[PDB]
Amino acid sequence: ASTDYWQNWTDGGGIVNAVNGSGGNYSVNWSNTGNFVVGKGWTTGSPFRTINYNAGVWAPNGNGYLTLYGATRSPLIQYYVVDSWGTYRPTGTYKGTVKSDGGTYDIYTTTRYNAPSIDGDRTTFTQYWSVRQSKRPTGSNATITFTNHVNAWKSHGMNLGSNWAYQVMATEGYQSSGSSNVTVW
C-alpha cells in the first residue's frame, strides 16, 4: 500500500536535478528547461485511489505544474489533476467543471501526436485535464479524490481505458526554472 514508482524524464533541455528521496518523498530543482516530468506514485493506477500529498516546497519560476499525472493504454490517454502552477494555468478545450477536495476544477481536453510519418501521417494521444480554478494552498496534507474526476470526465465523454499504466503526483515544467518538494502516499 506504498508508493512504488518513480518517474524522472526530461527532453534534455537545461537542468533537471531530481532526487528520488526515501519513501514517498522527492524533490526537483530545475533551470532553463525544455519539458520535464518528475513524480512519485504507483506502477498501476486505479480509478479508486485517493492520492495524498504534502508539498513542502512549491516554487515554480515560470511555467510548472503540481499535478496528478497518469495514463491508460490502448490507445494511450494521459490525464491530469492540476492543483497548482506557476505563471501559466493550463487550459484546453473546455468541457465543464467538477468540485473535489475543497476545490473547483475546470475540465479540458488536449491532444498530442506521435512523430508524423514520412508522409505526414499522425497518430494522436489525448489528454484529460482537471485544473483547479485557483492555486491550491501547499504545505499541509492534501487529497485528490481521483474517483470524482474519473466520474466527471465520464459524464463529459472522457472515458479512460481499462488498461492502467503509471499514476504519479508530479512536478512538470516547460521552458522554466523552479523547485519543488513533495511527499506522496
Side-chain angles (χ1 to χ4, degrees):
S2 293
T3 60
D4 61 19
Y5 174 74
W6 167 241
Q7 167 67 301
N8 181 13
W9 176 84
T10 173
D11 64 8
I15 306 312
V16 180
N17 288 328
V19 178
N20 183 356
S22 62
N25 177 260
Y26 72 92
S27 60
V28 202
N29 286 263
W30 70 98
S31 190
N32 296 343
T33 63
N35 195 204
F36 75 86
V37 190
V38 175
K40 282 194 165 168
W42 302 269
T43 61
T44 305
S46 175
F48 303 128
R49 176 169 289 123
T50 291
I51 290 85
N52 304 272
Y53 73 88
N54 174 315
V57 178
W58 180 244
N61 175 34
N63 183 353
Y65 315 142
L66 180 62
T67 185
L68 180 67
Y69 166 50
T72 65
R73 285 172 59 258
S74 308
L76 198 295
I77 299 170
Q78 293 172 298
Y79 61 79
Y80 301 84
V81 179
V82 179
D83 271 352
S84 193
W85 58 88
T87 302
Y88 171 69
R89 175 173 184 276
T91 71
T93 295
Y94 177 94
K95 304 299 204 151
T97 61
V98 58
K99 298 178 191 70
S100 196
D101 309 284
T104 305
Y105 296 81
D106 295 316
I107 301 168
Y108 307 97
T109 68
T110 62
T111 61
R112 293 179 164 119
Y113 52 88
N114 296 329
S117 82
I118 191 78
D119 295 323
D121 201 64
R122 292 183 184 196
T123 296
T124 58
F125 58 108
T126 295
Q127 292 73 53
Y128 297 164
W129 301 80
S130 292
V131 181
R132 212 170 179 275
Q133 289 187 161
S134 59
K135 293 178 186 178
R136 191 171 186 173
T138 60
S140 295
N141 296 358
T143 286
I144 295 174
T145 303
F146 182 52
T147 313
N148 285 340
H149 300 274
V150 170
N151 287 349
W153 296 346
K154 287 154 30 56
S155 83
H156 291 287
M158 294 157 63
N159 298 110
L160 287 168
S162 56
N163 307 306
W164 288 84
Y166 52 89
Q167 180 176 65
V168 288
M169 189 68 199
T171 299
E172 172 163 350
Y174 191 57
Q175 303 213 154
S176 68
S177 307
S179 68
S180 67
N181 191 302
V182 183
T183 306
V184 186
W185 65 99

